[PDB]
């Protein structure tokens, strides 16, 4: 069942077809499908334990020994060192879900694993895999239509952020920041809403600078309606706090000008040397005077500067910073409402950015100094400063906040939501099963397999919360059938009720639709593969 | 089916994976090993460890600091790595509490292992620990006492805090003198948190009791050749100029002439420019000149002929410290002598310390920069003394920034543990068991403190628990004889910030490690 076709002749002479055909394996027919299904099942069963509020974290170690404790499914699978090609396909599935939506990167893996598990027993009964894929696609269309039917709209206005805060809380519940849950959700909602082109357009994440510094406490995480900079004032004797600052943003180093072209300046006499020295001194004084003429109280440079400029700035009561990064320059000028000026001669009063407070922040006994610019008038750029007891919690909070921001961005794109906790999955499974009964017999099996694979998310939630999966799932489904209420889900937090609408477990419709679509397409693609030719 | 126990192989060569019970076992073993390694260095009777390096240097390091111990070890258990990073971050935030936070996290994880063995879901343990941490934080905050108003009471509190911090370290032999030294050094900062302004100079030879805080400042640089070696009523000019073959910053410039006479004239012009630079510096009316960069032979000769000291190569820290201690301004241009403030001090001279010569500043004007000389029998003693003094200075700076203080000697731990037990006694479910385990770890901390001293720890902890439940909220361990006493009367106090950070960081790291059910290792490079 390998080595291609090992015959070597019909007569006795050499029979060589493919280069190095004696060191190449090959899997054909149903055996390849069984291997792929088993591999995907293993990956999905590994990943399903990190699902829901009661899900447990996974603790990755890379090839350099660095430790990354995380719950993000896409992050977990990305750092996994797999060799099987189907495992790589599942990792890419998670990456696709993270790219398009940013949330639900774990549910897709579990859904694909359940779909392939059902397809295994369907193939065991003699159904062609393409028939299974077609049935899965039909059931996915039915489920997507049902999700659109049972969807609910929310108000995305800035005045009423309660639905947005509830959605962000639902997203963050599974993450470790559920201790600061409400604060993290509120700051994520405010960060997204501040930097967002409000006519239902995109949200640019380059306007959100998520920065984390160790120390402090997780509750100290805050949203700064401005820019926080990892630099400090150039001269140590400059004041540490500037109020009502008028910031001048420059990309010209405070050095005497230098032409780009290959140039030689010839000195031919003592008079020429004196003229050159005087020229340098007057250029320093002239650039400082030009900066001070606009009335700016603070200067920010990108390329650094030398000692004479430093002492002139200190002597003229002009605090300044140097070597600010280009992205940081852009963010500062966006937040302060000022323009970026490439040389001192182009500096005017109208190009100065205004900031209410510019301060230098200390971090205990660590010698590190970081600059913060805030209290702007109408700043269109925000930064998130995360504090924690170790770098692992900093990274985990970073990815959790990214998930929350992505969820609110999806809410910006579309305002339709569905109620999680497995309620949407149970309702979709019920709709799929109902549609199967009104269908010819052959694809009924594929449709019912799709429904059973959909019904794995509530079972995983029940198992992770300690409840009996089958009993709880059956009771919830029976209650959903009895009274028309697709919001009944799995009470993971044991609040006493199954009504997710009353429990405020809210998820975006786009997220569920993308989950189902991606899982269906990848299950079809995996099912269609029947030959493996590893070297 | 598992990722590793499957008929198909899904991993690269060398990749590993440990499921629920195996991963929990590895994490708990690593955490307990780290906790048992770092402990026995805790409390007034804690001992030191020797850290032999396996590298080519093979540097020797004896220390009592938990963060130092955890930093310089080869750790491969990832949970142990988490605890090590916790200790490092705790050291960065505040000077003290590394051993306490590491031991607290280890005890919490041991209790978590016991609870898991008792068939309790880890999420229940985490929720119980969250509630317990909230209760303990509230109790510790309520127990805080502030003496920032009264100056003499605050000085007494600072002295007590420095003594408590230095009790465990090697400096406990001369704790009284070292406490006075550290308190004076911190108070000389005039409220600034700049710990870099306090310079520690380690000179071999002499007893540890020979260490002192200089009334002025000490520099480890050299004076020029012909310049005076002693100046009275010095006028200090701190600079950051080149003064080394000072060239015009037009890097495209060059000398292109048709005779050597022109080259000689240009060289004379260069020397004249340097002379004019020195004259402009001298026009300020100074007796001593400190420059961050090097000073070449020509300006040194000019200063010597002018009778002005020219100290060179004082790095950024040096010039900053001189500016803080004398009040001068770090200048780089001298076209406005009247806009530059000049530092001042009563006397500058050269002092003999051991076998090295240092520049001594006496009668400094501002004096907001301390220099401390450490004398020890061995280099290891000097390093440990420097680390202990740094811990004391960090804790004192934190206390100056935030004046709230809490009682030590196990009083705070037992108080928060009593609060946690009170909350657990009125809570239904297994969360009560989890919170009881949290309180048990909190009790275990002073239990380890008493174990390190050889006393009857069980009886002492029982007495402490009885006193804290009865209402004696200031009862703590009296390590002088091995009984319990009043920490307020005895005078064992700690910064509230340090204790709160220890508690919160330990609980957070325990929660982080406890949430893990699977460890996946990628194939290493080696």
């Amino acid at each position: 069942a390998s080595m291609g076709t090992l015959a070597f002749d019909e007569y006795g002479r050499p029979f060589l077809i493919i280069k190095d055909q004696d060191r190449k394996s090959r899997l054909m027919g149903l055996e390849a499908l069984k291997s792929h299904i088993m591999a995907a099942k293993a990956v999905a069963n590994t990943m399903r334990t990190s699902l829901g509020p009661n899900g447990l974290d996974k603790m990755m170690v890379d090839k350099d020994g660095d430790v990354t404790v995380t719950n993000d499914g896409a992050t977990i699978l990305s750092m996994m060192d797999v060799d099987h090609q189907i495992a790589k396909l599942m990792v890419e599935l998670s990456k696709s879900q993270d790219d398009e939506i940013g949330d639900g990167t774990t549910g897709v893996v579990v859904l694909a694993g359940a779909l392939l598990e059902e397809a295994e027993q369907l193939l065991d009964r003699g159904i062609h895999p393409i028939r299974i894929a077609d049935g899965y696609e039909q059931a996915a269309r039915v489920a997507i239509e049902h999700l659109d039917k049972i969807s609910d709209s929310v108000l995305v206005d800035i005045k009423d952020t309660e639905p947005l805060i509830q959605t962000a809380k639902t997203t963050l519940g599974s993450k470790v920041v559920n201790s600061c849950h409400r604060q993290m959700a509120e700051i994520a909602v405010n960060a997204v809403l501040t930097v967002a082109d409000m006519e239902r357009r995109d949200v640019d994440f380059e306007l959100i600078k998520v920065e984390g510094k160790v120390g402090g406490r997780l509750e100290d995480t805050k949203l700064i309606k401005g820019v926080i900079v990892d630099k400090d004032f150039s001269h140590p004797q400059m004041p540490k706090k500037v109020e009502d600052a008028k910031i001048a943003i420059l990309t010209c180093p405070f050095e005497p000008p230098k032409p780009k072209t290959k140039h030689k300046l010839d000195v031919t006499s003592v008079e020429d040397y004196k003229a050159l020295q005087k020229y340098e001194k007057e250029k320093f004084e002239e650039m400082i005077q030009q900066i001070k003429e606009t009335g700016a109280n603070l200067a920010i440079c990108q390329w650094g500067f030398d000692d004479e400029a430093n002492h002139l700035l200190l002597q003229n009561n002009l605090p300044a910073v140097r070597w600010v990064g280009g992205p940081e320059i852009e963010l500062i000028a966006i937040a302060t409402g000022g323009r970026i000026v490439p040389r001192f001669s182009e500096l005017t009063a109208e190009k100065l950015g205004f900031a209410g407070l510019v301060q230098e922040i200390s971090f205990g006994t660590t010698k590190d100094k970081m600059l913060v610019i805030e209290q702007c008038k109408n700043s269109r750029a925000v930064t998130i400063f995360i504090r924690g007891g170790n770098k692992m919690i900093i990274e985990e909070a970073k990815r959790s906040l990214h998930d929350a921001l992505c969820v609110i961005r999806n809410l910006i794109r579309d305002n339709r939501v569905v109620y999680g906790g497995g309620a949407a999955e149970i309702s979709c499974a019920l709709a799929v099963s109902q549609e199967a009964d009104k269908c010819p017999t052959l694809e009924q099996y594929a449709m019912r397999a799709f429904a059973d694979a959909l019904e794995v998310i509530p079972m995983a939630l029940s198992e992770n919360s300690g409840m009996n999966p089958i009993q709880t799932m059956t009771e919830v489904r029976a209650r959903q059938v009895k009274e028309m209420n697709p919001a009944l889900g799995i009470d993971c937090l044991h609040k006493g009720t199954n009504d997710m609408k009353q429990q405020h477990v809210i998820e975006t419709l786009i997220g569920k639709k993308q989950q189902i679509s991606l899982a269906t397409q990848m299950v079809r693609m995996i099912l269609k593969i029947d030959d493996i030719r590893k070297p | 089916a598992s990722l590793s126990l499957a008929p198909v192989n899904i991993f690269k060569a060398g990749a590993d994976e440990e499921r629920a019970e195996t991963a929990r076992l590895t994490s708990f073993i690593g955490a307990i090993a780290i906790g048992d390694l770092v402990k026995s260095t805790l409390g007034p009777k804690g001992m030191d460890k020797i850290l032999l390096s396996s590298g080519r240097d093979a540097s020797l390091m004896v220390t009592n600091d938990g963060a130092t111990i955890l930093k310089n070890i080869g750790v491969d258990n990832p949970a142990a790595k988490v605890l090590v990073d916790m200790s490092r971050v705790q050291d960065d935030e505040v000077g003290d509490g590394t051993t306490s936070v590491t031991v607290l996290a280890a005890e919490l994880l041991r209790e978590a292992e016991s609870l898991i063995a008792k068939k309790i879901h880890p999420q229940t343990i985490i929720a119980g620990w969250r509630e317990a941490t909230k209760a303990a934080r509230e109790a510790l905050l309520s127990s805080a006492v502030d003496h920032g108003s009264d100056e003499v009471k605050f000085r007494q509190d600072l002295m007590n805090i420095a003594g408590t911090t230095l009790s465990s370290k090697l400096l406990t032999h001369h704790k009284d003198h070292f406490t006075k030294l550290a308190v004076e050094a911190v108070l000389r900062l005039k409220g600034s948190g700049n710990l870099e302004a306090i310079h520690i100079i380690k000179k071999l030879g002499g007893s540890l009791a020979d260490s002192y805080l200089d009334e002025g400042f000490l520099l480890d640089k050299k004076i020029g050749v012909n310049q005076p070696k002693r100046i009275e009523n010095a006028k200090i000019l701190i600079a950051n100029t080149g003064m080394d073959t000072d060239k015009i910053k037009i890097f495209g410039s060059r000398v292109r002439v048709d005779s050597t006479a022109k080259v000689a004239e240009i060289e004379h012009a260069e020397k004249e420019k340097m002379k004019e630079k020195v004259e402009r510096i001298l026009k300020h009316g100074i007796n001593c000149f400190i420059n961050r960069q090097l000073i070449y032979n020509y300006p040194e000769q000019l200063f010597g002929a002018a009778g002005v000291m020219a100290i060179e190569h004082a790095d950024f820290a040096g010039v900053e410290r001189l500016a803080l201690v004398t009040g001068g301004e770090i200048a780089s241009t001298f076209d406005h002598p009247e806009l530059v403030k000049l530092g001042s001090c009563k006397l500058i001279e050269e002092v003999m310390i051991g076998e090295d010569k240092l520049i001594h500043f006496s009668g400094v004007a501002l004096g907001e920069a301390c220099t401390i000389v450490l004398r020890g029998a061995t280099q290891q003693i000097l390093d440990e003394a420097e680390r202990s003094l740094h811990d004391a200075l960090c804790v004192l700076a934190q206390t100056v920034k935030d004046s709230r203080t809490v009682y030590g000697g196990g009083c705070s731990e037992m108080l928060m543990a009593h609060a946690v037990t009170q909350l657990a006694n009125r809570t239904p479910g297994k969360e009560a068991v989890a919170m009881e385990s949290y309180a048990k770890a909190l009790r275990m901390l002073p239990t380890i403190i008493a174990d390190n001293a050889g006393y009857d720890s069980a009886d002492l902890v029982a007495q402490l628990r009885a006193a804290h439940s009865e209402g004696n909220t200031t009862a703590g361990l009296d390590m002088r004889e091995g009984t319990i006493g009043d920490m307020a009367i005895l005078g064992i106090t700690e910064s509230f910030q340090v204790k709160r950070q220890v508690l919160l960081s330990a609980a957070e790291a325990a929660e982080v490690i406890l949430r893990v059910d699977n460890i996946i290792k990628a194939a290493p490079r080696k």
């Binding site: 150039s234 650094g304 000692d307 140097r322 990064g325 | 790095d315 950024f316």
Partner: peptide
């Protein structure tokens, strides 16, 4: 690393 004028790592 880089900018010996200030003695700090830039960019």
């Amino acid at each position: 690393v880089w900018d010996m004028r200030s003695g700090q790592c830039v960019q």
